[PDB]
Design a protein around this ligand. Structure first.
Ligand SMILES: O=C(NC1CC1)N1CCN(C(=O)c2ccco2)CC1
Length: 121
């Protein structure tokens, strides 16, 4: 399964699954500051799933590793902004992270394999 380009549609499909998860709703658009006035005092680099999908569709990811770094920033931002590890929204982030990691592992493996096969000679 040595298609170097296959990761892109596999990531589009996984983002569609994430958008169907009720657990994604807080992460689907950039945070608003009128409701969370201290956000940018805590979080240096905001990230959300609409920004990830737009970056993919623009052709501005070169690999699934880059997409994975931005998705993991969504989750690290939630863990750093949360006032409690028992937060509703943080709790939603941890379920969504487990789902994402379960599904991204084969996408990363297949891409890295494809690149090694390309450079086999
Ligand atoms: O306002 C939004 N998101 C809506 C615009 C879709 N968020 C999601 C990100 N936040 C957190 O990760 C968090 C952890 C604990 C409490 O919030 C702040 C609130």
């Amino acid at each position: 399964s040595y298609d170097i380009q296959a990761w892109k549609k596999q990531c589009e499909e996984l983002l569609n699954l994430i958008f169907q998860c009720e657990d994604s709703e807080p992460f689907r658009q950039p945070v608003d500051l009128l409701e969370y006035p201290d956000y940018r005092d805590i979080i240096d680099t905001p990230m959300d799933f609409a920004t990830v999908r737009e970056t993919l569709e623009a052709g501005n990811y070169e690999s699934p590793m880059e997409l994975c770094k931005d998705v993991r920033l969504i989750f690290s931002n939630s863990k750093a902004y949360t006032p409690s590890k028992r937060s509703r929204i943080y709790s939603m982030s941890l379920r969504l992270s487990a789902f994402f990691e379960e599904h991204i592992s084969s996408v990363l493996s297949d891409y890295k394999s494809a690149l090694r096969f390309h450079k086999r000679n």
